Amino acid sequence: NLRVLLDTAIPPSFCDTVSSVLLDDFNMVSLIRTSPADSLATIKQDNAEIDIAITIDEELKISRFNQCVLGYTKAFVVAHPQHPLCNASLHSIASLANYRQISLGSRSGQHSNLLRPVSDKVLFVENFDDMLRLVEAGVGWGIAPHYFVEERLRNGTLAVLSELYEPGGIDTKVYCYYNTALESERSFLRFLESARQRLRELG
Amino acid sequence: NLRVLLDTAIPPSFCDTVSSVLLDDFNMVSLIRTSPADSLATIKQDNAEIDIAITIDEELKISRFNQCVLGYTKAFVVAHPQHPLCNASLHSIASLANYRQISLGSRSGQHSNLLRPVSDKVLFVENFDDMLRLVEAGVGWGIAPHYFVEERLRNGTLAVLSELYEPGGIDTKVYCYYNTALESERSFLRFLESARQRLRELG
Ligand SMILES: COCCn1c(NC[C@H](O)COc2ccc(CC#N)cc2)nc2ccc(Cl)cc21
Ligand SMILES: COCCn1c(NC[C@H](O)COc2ccc(CC#N)cc2)nc2ccc(Cl)cc21
């Protein structure tokens, strides 16, 4: 049984890219969904016996796992179109650190530099739905995956704030944390090879 | 006088991209070159009076500067073609943390998570030349900008180790740290707009 973690930030397509290839080589494949904020926390619990985590979250070296880059995805800073920081930028981008942020919370209470909130006014939720609900209502601003805001952006229900910080969305590496034991196993190298070249095409 | 920091990791072309645009708007422009390992350390010294730093190094918020993304460049992990970790990977990638690393040193003695050495066996130098000299000689492995190893790679003088970690080179955001005062100044927004769309073309 190959246990596999995919965080909520990973487009649901890339999750079909993996399972397709994995099931070619492996006979039992378990797919677990975590918050980006809980991915590395989960694999660190030995009893969770995760073999592969696909997550946006970064840490220099986890005990017994190796890291590599599967590809890249795009986050966007979004708010209600009538948000103060909306319809403006550069001073707005800076002010994000003052206006209320709707942030992914974590069981560990802790965050990475990458995922920790930027604003001194933060309201925590558990997933990107509860985030973008409290954002459609103009309670604050949030940063969420492209695939979560594509629908609402063209609808005009949500507006982008991020473009002057990073045009075309904030590029974010997708990392593969794999059990060191998979290190010399064509099965896993087949997964990387395929999973990679397929997730280029989505991008 | 607009003082401008460009770290050694920034291709020398992108440094012509900036100066071209900047000199269109500004009448005195000073261009300082730093180690990536010394960029943010330098702008933090108030007396250094840096107005714009273009550097690969990341920190969540520097006092009085705002951050944004200019674009992306590619580092490669390189070694002597007869290096043990050479002509191999995945276990080799993991072993990088054991074999000797030739690392950029810093006046502050300190490094960011991004720039800190990965290996327990590290020999510090001051620039990418001294790095790739001690690497051509097989004293250790190093990670250097594409533009620094393009020549030597096709020559066969150096080999890439990084490809199974991140195919096509390890993508690295180029950051613009700009004095908050430039925040609402078409001059600076002109620089970003131009500098960005021009540095897409190099990539
Ligand atoms: C840099 O984001 C990529 C990683 N990432 C986060 N991180 C949440 C942190 O609280 C930082 O949020 C920031 C918001 C604004 C700026 C400037 C502008 N504009 C910088 C950082 N949340 C994410 C959600 C989804 C994805 Cl794919 C990546 C995410
Ligand atoms: C992740 O690198 C991008 C930032 N960056 C560094 N950082 C030097 C650190 O000691 C980490 O070196 C690593 C070497 C190997 C691996 C896995 C593989 N393969 C991961 C990290 N040095 C750089 C030099 C130039 C540029 Cl453009 C970026 C650099």
Numbering used by the authors:
A (entry chain A), B (entry chain A): 94 to 296
Study authors write:
To enhance the physiochemical properties of the series through reducing lipophilicity, analogues with polar substituents were synthesized (6t R3 = methoxyethyl, 6u R3 = hydroxyethyl, and 6q R3 = dimethylaminoethyl). Compounds 6t and 6u were equipotent in PAO1-L with a 2-fold reduction in potency in relation to 6f, however, a structurally related dimethylamino-ethyl substitution in 6q obliterated the biological activity. To achieve this aim, two crystal structures of inhibitors (6f and 6t) complexed with the PqsRLBD were obtained. These revealed that both compounds bind in a similar manner to our previously reported PqsR inhibitor 1(25) except for an additional interaction between the 2-amino group and Arg209, which may have contributed to the enhancement of activity noted for the current series of compounds. The para-phenyl acetonitrile group of 6f, 6t adopted a parallel position to the Tyr258 in pocket B to maintain hydrophobic interactions as the case in 1. While the hydroxyl group position was altered slightly between the two series leading to form hydrogen bond with Leu208 and Arg209 in the benzimidazole derivatives compared to Leu208 and Glu194 in the quinazolinone derived inhibitor. However, unlike 1,136f and 6t form an additional hydrogen bond between the amino group at the 2-postion of the benzimidazole ring and the backbone of of Leu207, which may contribute to the observed enhanced potency. The crystal structure also corroborated our rational design that the lipophilic subpocket around (Leu207, Leu208, Ile236, and Ile263) can be exploited with lipophilic substituent at position 1 of the benzimidazole ring.
